[PDB]
Amino acid sequence: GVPTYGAIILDETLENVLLVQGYLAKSGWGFPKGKVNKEEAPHDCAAREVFEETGFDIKDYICKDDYIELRINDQLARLYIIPGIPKDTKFNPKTRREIRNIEWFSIEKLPCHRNDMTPKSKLGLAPNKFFMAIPFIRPLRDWLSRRFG
């Protein structure tokens, strides 16, 4: 799979993260990210995707070593961690054709797994609108503990 790059943007209290909601197959909430272009450096792709999806330019805030990277079904997703962005920042995607909405969420309220269906004796997981964000939540909480505490 082509690698994806983007950001986990936090506010000043470190309580809240910025998620984006797409359409169709991307109908739930997730961190802003997207696929790297040929010859494009990871930091430039993260900034490009984030600015296209949120209207906020992270370029001057990216730290090279501050990211969480996951490989999910043999596709690598790397989100640069961007703390301290004010909650009253006005975010606006470049294309309403791809982004429905942009919101801050409480980190402590976000799920870090989907729920099973063990009350129904059925296999699998119940739908969850935070599906794409979920894999990053525990690693983010662990990263924030180590970095700040």
Ligand X SMILES: O=C(NCc1ccc(F)cc1)c1ccn(C(F)F)n1
Annotated binding site for Mn(2+): 49, 53
> By CB under 6 A, is residue 54 in contact with ligand X?
no
Report the distance separating Cα 73 and Cα 29, nearest Å. Answer: 19
First to last CA, the chain: 35
> By CB under 6 A, is residue 30 in contact with ligand X?
yes
- Positions at the binding site: 49, 53
| Chain residue at closest Cβ approach to ligand X | 22
> By CB under 6 A, is residue 135 in contact with ligand X?
no
Of 20 and 58, nearer to ligand X (C-beta) is 20
Question: Which among 74, 86, 100 is positioned nearest to 21, based on CA atoms?
Answer: 100
User: Is 80 in contact with 69 (CB distance < 8 Å)?
Assistant: no
> By CB under 6 A, is residue 132 in contact with ligand X?
yes
